[PDB]
Amino acid sequence: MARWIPTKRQKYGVAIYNYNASQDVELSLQIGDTVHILEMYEGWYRGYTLQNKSKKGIFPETYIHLKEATVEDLGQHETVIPGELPLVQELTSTLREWAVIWRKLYVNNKLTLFRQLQQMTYSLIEWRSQILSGTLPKDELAELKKKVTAKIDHGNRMLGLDLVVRDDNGNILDPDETSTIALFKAHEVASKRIEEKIQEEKSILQNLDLRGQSIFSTIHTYGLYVNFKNFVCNIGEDAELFMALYDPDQSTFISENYLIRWGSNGMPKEIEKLNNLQAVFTDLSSMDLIRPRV
Amino acid sequence: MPPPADIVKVAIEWPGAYPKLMEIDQKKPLSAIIKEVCDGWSLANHEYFALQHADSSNFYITEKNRNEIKNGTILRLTTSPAQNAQQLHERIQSSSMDAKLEALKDLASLSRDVTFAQEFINLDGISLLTQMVESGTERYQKLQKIMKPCFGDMLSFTLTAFVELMDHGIVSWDTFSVAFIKKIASFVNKSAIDISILQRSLAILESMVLNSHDLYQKVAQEITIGQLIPHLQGSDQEIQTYTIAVINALFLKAPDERRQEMANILAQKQLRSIILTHVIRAQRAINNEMAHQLYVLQVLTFNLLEDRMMTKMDPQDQAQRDIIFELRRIAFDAESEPNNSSGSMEKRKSMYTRDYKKLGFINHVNPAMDFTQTPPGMLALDNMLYFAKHHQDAYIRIVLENSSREDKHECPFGRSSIELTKMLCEILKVGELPSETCNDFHPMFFTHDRSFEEFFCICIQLLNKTWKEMRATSEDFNKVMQVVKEQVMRALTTKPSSLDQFKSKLQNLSYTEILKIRQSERMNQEDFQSRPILELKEKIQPEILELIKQQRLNRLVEGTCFRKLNARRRQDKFWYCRLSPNHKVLHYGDLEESPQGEVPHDSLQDKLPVADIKAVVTGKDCPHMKEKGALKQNKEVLELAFSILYDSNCQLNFIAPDKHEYCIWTDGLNALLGKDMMSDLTRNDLDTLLSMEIKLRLLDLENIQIPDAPPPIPKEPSNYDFVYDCN
Structure with missing residues (x-):
């Protein structure tokens, strides 16, 4: 409770389990009871709690699951992988904002959105946990940045919150007041994204095909995956099965006939495929889709 | 709200009648349905005859139970419950035997029928049973002398029909005469008889005992416990069940003063031990009723302990004060020079306070202030009296080891004895009301009448043994007794069956190694649920419940x-x-x-x-x-x-x-x-929400796991002298 040192390597004041009121400013600490500590005694750390940043907590150093870094993860590289974990910590703040929201959500009954709140929350926190490490490949981490950004801004517009910017690698790089017009158009872009989400949520909430068309607009290589099962008939003779796409609109063929052999016994003449009677018909382009009769 | 399917596709039957599967209407008054059914067999007299479930019940369908006929439920016509009742009764008060046997088995079976019972009780055919089995013997006893196998079967079926009408209560419990109880006495007071007779007669014994404490009193001359042991010895379990049901009714209705009498009677006739060796530790299956019988036996012993348990016998009573004086002589005179055995009042005070700051008593002027509180008071005294007979080694060694420890590791034998006895009785539910609710019997108690007394001596022995193993203290006085209670829990959870096995279970408990196994199981069971983190969660409970409540307050407002x-x-x-x-x-x-x-x-x-x-x-x-x-x-x-x-x-x-x-x-x-709340809605929402909240606390640890156990407290500089200041 004495011999305190000024340092910044302790802002991860990390409670372990139920703490005790043995200390003037202490209680049954939760898990994430972060104290932004200022006073460095060896065996004990007392410092300003996350909950109350003018109120200290005097918590045993062993009970302090200290991580030397501050809430950031890159200055000393506590990022398991560089360039994101600022994103995860701002996600944590996002979550503690969702905290006060879901307290203010049973006061009314919109609980439909309260459900979807918890579910998007669960998706975000599982992305959080999976990106506790560099578990994904880096490009997949960029993908997850995109997805978490998407979910986050969704929640924000739901609560009519602010706009986050800098889609990728932080959400924070853009808003650093380095320029103006770039920032303006960043806001412009984010409002675009909000428009896109409101439109799609209306049009995926109610319609169910326009989403598929919009996604198929970008890429145009598609494949009809058929797993055939068994040709119900007994033949008594060898048989040959051919599977191809015909165009009555064009009065002609389209694809190559996938082949199956058939024994005379109502049985495929090749049995290693009987389970695996699998063909994938590719090359399906935007035109291939939009043809009237196929 | 809806009535049943009023048109039901059912078979209608009648003795001699080919069933007809018709679509019976059910809102009609059932008298007319009986009429049409009778007409189907060319019959009149509908009120003289009753339809019934051709299924198992044979319950004569009235206006009441006609909702219970399913599609396919066969209905069978027969004589009406009044006509069955009468046919019975004029067959019942009659004397021709085999006819009585048939009608009597059938009155037994049909007694449970409320629809029949109405008119057989209006009729008074149970008193006609009273005739057939109290006069009906003496009309015929010359040939009954040899027929008494079949006459015993007769009177046993009468016992069945009698009680199976008695249980409905519309007929009085008084229909049996003193001649009926005379026959029942001829059964219970005699040797093994036809098992139906003995069974249903012991059943009547417990039933009439249940009817009146006066019936119990006036059968206790006939119901005696020595003659009632053979019912236990009867390898038929149910004879044992009936002897012990009668015994438990005896103790329930014997006066507590006479209950101690009958408790010494139980102890001397070996009921505890003879049932252990003949029911529990015999091969006979301890059926749920039988396990309850044993639970009630042990708890009857315990509620005979109750009279001393609860009552606060005078702490300064001269007799009990001299008996704790002799207890403390055989306890203390080793380091107490024998001049204190007859010590004067000044020396009594001196020795009290000297070995009672060695016994850490808040008040050192009286050992009986460690007996002034009940439970149990003079019953812990009773425990130590048992020790003077059974565990003098234990009593002497505990008292001597706490006869010189002025420190707070002191084991206060007056206060510890009294509180340990009370807490383990509360653990053992010594003195609770025996009910069918609890069906657990401990064979531990039934290998020793005072297995409670050996329980307390050996548990205080373990208390002192581990008391050395966990630096047990008297500021931890209640805390050390609670650790001993934890040990008692880990022991009794193994369900001790004998004094040797109980001693083995306690010797398991002396903090040697198996505690790591119990906390390793605690590990494996927190794996899915994180028990210390559960502590964190459910400790900060009140917020979520109160917010739910004010939420519902909103809802009530709207x-x-x-x-x-x-x-x-x-x-x-x-x-x-x-x-x-x-x-x-x-x-x-x-x-x-x-x-x-x-x-x-x-x-x-x-x-x-x-x-x-x-x-x-x-x-x-x-x-x-x-x-x-x-x-x-x-x-x-x-x-x-x-x-x-x-x-x-x-x-x-x-x-x-x-x-x-x-x-x-x-x-x-x-x-x-x-x-508290009574919406399962509350359960679901509260659990999911608080679980999420704590799941929103795992954040500061993540990618790194928690120390499950409490880490230590690292030392401070005791002073508050800040090298880096606050603020």
């Missing part, structure tokens, strides 16, 4: 269009019950059929103070449900019918519109009452 009594004929099935912001006044009553719901105003019953609210009885518990006339409510409104209590004379006897909000309002009024 209330609903509640539903009334019999909202049938142009009555407001919709009427608002607004909770005021004051949350002391509910605005409701005959409010119109409101679409938007609440008209916030001084309603027809604008007031409802919590000050007169008692509770809400929910369902048939509602006083309006207790009405069975022009306010009958079908059991489908059970979940909507609530009766909010107030004034002790006016209640909110109303109907909910559905189930969930019924639960909600019950919850809300209970929060008003300041008690």
